[PDB]
Design a protein around this nucleic acid. Sequence first.
RNA 1: ACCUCGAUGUUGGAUCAGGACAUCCCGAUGGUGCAGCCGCUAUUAAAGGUUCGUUUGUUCAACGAUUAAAGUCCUACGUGAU
RNA 2: CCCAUAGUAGGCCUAAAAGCAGCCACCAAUUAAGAAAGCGUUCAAGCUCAACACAAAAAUCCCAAACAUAUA
Lengths: 205, 140, 43, 23, 37, 157, 157, 335, 118, 80
Amino acid sequence: KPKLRFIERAPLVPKVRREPKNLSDIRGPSTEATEFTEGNFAILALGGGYLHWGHFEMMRLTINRSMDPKNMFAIWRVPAPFKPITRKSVGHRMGGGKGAIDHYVTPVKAGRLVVEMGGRCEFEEVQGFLDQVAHKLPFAAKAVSRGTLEKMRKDQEERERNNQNPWTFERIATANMLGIRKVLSPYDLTHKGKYWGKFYMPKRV
Amino acid sequence: GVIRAIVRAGLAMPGPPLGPVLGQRGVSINQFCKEFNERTKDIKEGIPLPTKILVKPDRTFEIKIGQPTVSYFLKAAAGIEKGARQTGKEVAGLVTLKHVYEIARIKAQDEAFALQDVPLSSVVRSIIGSARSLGIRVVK
Amino acid sequence: RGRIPGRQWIGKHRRPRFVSLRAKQNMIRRLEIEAENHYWLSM
Amino acid sequence: SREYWRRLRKQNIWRHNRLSKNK
Amino acid sequence: FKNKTVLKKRCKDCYLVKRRGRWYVYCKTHPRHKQRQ
Amino acid sequence: FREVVETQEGKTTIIEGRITATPKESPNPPNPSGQCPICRWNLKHKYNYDDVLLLSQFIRPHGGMLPRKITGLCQEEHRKIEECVKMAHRAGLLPNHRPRLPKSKPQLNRYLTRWAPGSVKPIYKKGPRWNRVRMPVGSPLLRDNVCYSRTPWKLYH
Amino acid sequence: SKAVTRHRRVMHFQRQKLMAVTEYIPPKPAIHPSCLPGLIRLLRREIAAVFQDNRMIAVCQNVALSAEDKLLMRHQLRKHKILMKVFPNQVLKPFLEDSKYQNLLPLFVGHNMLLVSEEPKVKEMVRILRTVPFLPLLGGCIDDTILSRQGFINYSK
Amino acid sequence: CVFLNVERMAAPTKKELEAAWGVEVFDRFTVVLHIFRCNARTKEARLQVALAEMPLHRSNLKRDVAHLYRGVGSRYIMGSGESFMQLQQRLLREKEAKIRKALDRLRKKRHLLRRQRTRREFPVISVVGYTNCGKTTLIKALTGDAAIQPRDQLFATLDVTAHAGTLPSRMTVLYVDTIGFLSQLPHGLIESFSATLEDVAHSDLILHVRDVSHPEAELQKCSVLSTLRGLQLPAPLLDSMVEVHNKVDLVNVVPVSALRGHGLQELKAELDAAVLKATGRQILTLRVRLAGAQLSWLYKEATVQEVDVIPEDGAADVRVIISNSAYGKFRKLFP
Amino acid sequence: NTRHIAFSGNKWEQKVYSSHTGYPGGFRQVTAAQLHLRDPVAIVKLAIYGMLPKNLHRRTMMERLHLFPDEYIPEDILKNLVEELPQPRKIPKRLDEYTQEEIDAFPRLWTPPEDYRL
Amino acid sequence: VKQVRVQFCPFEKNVESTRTFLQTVSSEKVRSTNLNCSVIADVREPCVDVLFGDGHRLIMRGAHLTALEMLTAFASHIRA
RNA sequence: ACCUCGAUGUUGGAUCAGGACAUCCCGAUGGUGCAGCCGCUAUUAAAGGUUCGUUUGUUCAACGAUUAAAGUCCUACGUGAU
RNA sequence: CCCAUAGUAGGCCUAAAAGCAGCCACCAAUUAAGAAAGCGUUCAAGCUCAACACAAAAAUCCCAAACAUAUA
Ligand SMILES: Nc1nc2c(ncn2[C@@H]2O[C@H](COP(=O)(O)OP(=O)(O)OP(=O)(O)O)[C@@H](O)[C@H]2O)c(=O)[nH]1
Ligand SMILES: [Mg+2]
Ligand SMILES: [Mg+2]
Ligand SMILES: [Mg+2]
Ligand SMILES: [Mg+2]
Ligand SMILES: [Mg+2]
Ligand SMILES: [Mg+2]
Ligand SMILES: [Mg+2]
Ligand SMILES: [Zn+2]
Ligand SMILES: [Zn+2]
């Protein structure tokens, strides 16, 4: 089964309890599926967002059509949509209770791998359509191999080490210099200024 | 222009594989098949024969012919009619190195095919590769 | 032409604000003062 | 060895073909 | 000429030239490949 | 420098080439080991569009730039020289390097012109103060030129 | 507005100043570093063996011929014991000094095809060349003795 | 829910049945409309199914807006005189007008697309028939294409699409796969697809794929003929309509089996005859001097069935199927 | 010599002077080059007007201002003149204006290949 | 074009231009363009003499001319 | 639900129209599945123009006859101290 | 940029499928060429390639004037 598996619109057992939109699941760096597993190429999420069944279908169809099943294999690194999103009826005034469940999404945090590909192939063969998929994803994304991912991580570390600016967001936030914690968020103490909402500023040091 | 065909010396008028393909340039099918049958009489009968016909702008025929094909020749040498399906594990006939050498003796003599290398190795290697690609094992 | 929807500086669509070299220098000066404060409080 | 580099050239052509399958 | 934010050469004979302040894909064999930025 | 001379005699046109005198680099460059003329003569960030005495040394007789493979310039300095040459031509500082061959055009004095005069559209609607459509001046390639003023160069006006 | 917005939320001016002041500053490297200071050996042995074994050598420019014309020329040459060889100039240049052929340097530029042999059928080869009024015979060196075209003609006669 | 196998139930009937049975009620119209909406994938198909839905939206207007009334009207002394229901009906009419305008644009674009195939004189055979009768499978068998995917479900094909194939006369014929027809269904539903189905009207021949194995093949024939007449296909074309009995394996015309591929060669023979007699193409022998590129011109502008060459006169007699336009062009070009 | 002013950059084509006659459709936007070719004093007059304070004395100041497109100046104004202010911008020299001494002084930065057509 | 003659002396340097001109003009495409057009590659400063169908001669002394320039002049005179 | 309930008079029509161009026609240009005529599409162009009637309060819509066209909008759903 | 002969139309496959519809193997000659990476062919043929050789737009009228080089 080398080709990418089908993803269902909603969980087979539908959720009954509406749940709050905890945007923290999109906010911040990703702590899961951040490393390669049984593959050499992948789509890395350089930002946060929700993946709909439409995005899943786009990824599946594009990758399946453009891959070589006898020499390439692909695997999801993101679960099927599970978080329920509720929409009220059009023309409804505010109030009257939380709306009924409309769709299911899967939260994705910046720094996570969405699809992982491997097999008897090199990056150049796959980067084309992986970049197509990444550009059509709801969040900033990039086709990255193991080597390129390590290269970008080492480049970030090098920039952090050799930055000539005496002042860093990390230092100022941690020390509460200028009383900037009045303007910053408690999450900023760990985001170090590299994350703003769902957006991940990669050039930010 | 040069027109290439692998027609069998037996049936000189198969039809579609010669008529429509040759008529576009403008040919005399009667003359073509007459000359091909003359060559068939000159050589053994009932065997594929590559052709090197060149249709001149003056609308004349200069048919050039040489040795039979390699695939059918090897299949006949190994006692095979239809080639192996897999061709990587399937085998139907075995050919010895001495037989390969003997057949090669009368192989590196054609002009159009360019099989003109002085060394025996140059041609024995080619025929061995053809046999390996086909479903024929090289004994010893 | 060139309208900011609603009130400037408050809404979702605010008037863009840009930091000048003057403001950057002022903030850096204050940061230096506070770094010296950290040093003198560390002993 | 001539055949060594002949095989190397064949493999390089194969790699180029695989890379250009999509290009 | 079709305005395209991304300019692509659609055959060997398409050439990129910056004229009157913007890029153009010009082509003579296939004029339908002509594009403007 | 070679020059090609073609002579039409009778109905037998001949064409030959003669190598005339060629200039030589001044002896004793201030900074030997410089990988190109500019960085060798200590001019990396110390020339402007109006330094015609410098620009003309990398100029074809009709005003076109000379290739890198011939001039020896590094890529960045080649780009800087090309832009400075364009600005000088537009400013009129190269009156003997004009195109080979004219109706009278209006005489508008210029200098530090980044764009070709005939390719820029008028700024009919300058944006708001926070999104103003500014008029470029000079070239960004010269942003690193030695700045003797406390304020940096304003590349946009 | 929520903490996570579909658009880039506007930052508080103090946060904007913080982000501008804590921007990455790359290390300026003072002086720009840019302007600071098997098969080959197989054919080496092949050329050495050719030079040693062959008694007479000649060269030509067999590049203007079709595939079929080149094949026919090769056939006519193989009718005799002479063998035609093709080798890159990039690696032939060292061979001249290696084998002590100083006069051969200004002979192998561009396409070059050797015509190595021991028994000269140069008479019939020149006869073949005559009906094709191009592909001139180019200077060679028989048994460590450079021969010009007139030398080859005299030797043939 | 309950599926009442009726063409269309009136509003009072639906209301009474809903109240009595305590569940949702669906008719043939609603069910077919639902499957059309589900299967529709192209923008054209979505637009056409939206036009088909419009009657459903009009019928269900009251229920779809009952949650927006808010009890506002007739006492608020200022505003447009339109009441709540009047405004909702106006909005629905505006939406329908937008859909119809878009469909008119789509029809114009389809004519634009057909321009080229019409100019080059490709014979066009529109494959029509009852739903699930094997139109797509037959077109796959005839053309040889592999991208064609004949599904098992009803109304699989919702897009009118053209696939080229070769006849025994070496002539290239363009088969137009169309949407299947169903019985006991409102005519408006299918007629909403007329924008894309007008390719059938401009077809040179029509091929009715009868599902002979089906018990109600006669009723299917009646339904499809009535549907075509409602679609207003040209009378000469409907008269010249050929018939093919598909699914003959399960059990004056040509019996065929698309999956097994049994009568395909015969069917191709009759299709060849039909296209000759329909497109006005004359199969004739033509003597041409073997020079001046006349033979190449004939190859490229006509289907050269065969060439018998006479070298004594240095000429060739070509048996060729040539249209009237091509024959005129040849006569003028090579007197 | 207000006719011979020089704009930096492409301002001759990008700078737009806007006015409105007041009547509907009376909005006129004329590029700097067009305005200069029409009136050879308008550019400098408008610059001075926009730089002067926006009060009731501005028009009196503009009356005191005198602008002349070319070298010619009225005799009475010439007799009134007291001092000549230095030109804010030093005009760069052209190659034709460079003396042979300066050209010789400036070093040759590179040895052009002898066999180059130039 | 009628005839094209190329003369050069290889042992004397400054012959690359003329040799490349020969290798380009004798190219089978160029010669097939006009089979009647006769090339003569004589050899013994280096010169290229082109006699055209109109009895007009173009003499290119390729001592200090690059092959591109020689070929451009040759094409221009072909155009006439 | 932020101004107006010690009044900001309400949908259409008449009258006069101002403006935007995302152009319906007239102008210039590129492509075309541009043979020509009709066209389709795109760039530029807002100087000028953009009909009369039956039904219906109709803004709209259907229909009749035209037109080079009978454009999409905004203007307090422009315009009731006209 | 130049350049392209050829075991052979590799087998099976199929009416034929010939580097190119699909499956298996993917060797091998010429110094140099994938049993072929894209076009094109019903099929061929012809083209290459790889290989040698050397950013945006809306409605009263844009919107301080300007300015790159005098030492924080
Ligand atoms: N047994 C048998 N089944 C057949 C035959 N021809 C078609 N079918 C089946 O009939 C069904 C028709 O599928 P399609 O051919 O895609 O349907 P269609 O005619 O395009 O009609 P729509 O699905 O309404 O678009 C499929 O299950 C086919 O496999 C046949 O000759 N024999
Ligand atoms: Mg406001
Ligand atoms: Mg179907
Ligand atoms: Mg309120
Ligand atoms: Mg409130
Ligand atoms: Mg009051
Ligand atoms: Mg416009
Ligand atoms: Mg190549
Ligand atoms: Zn093109
Ligand atoms: Zn440098």
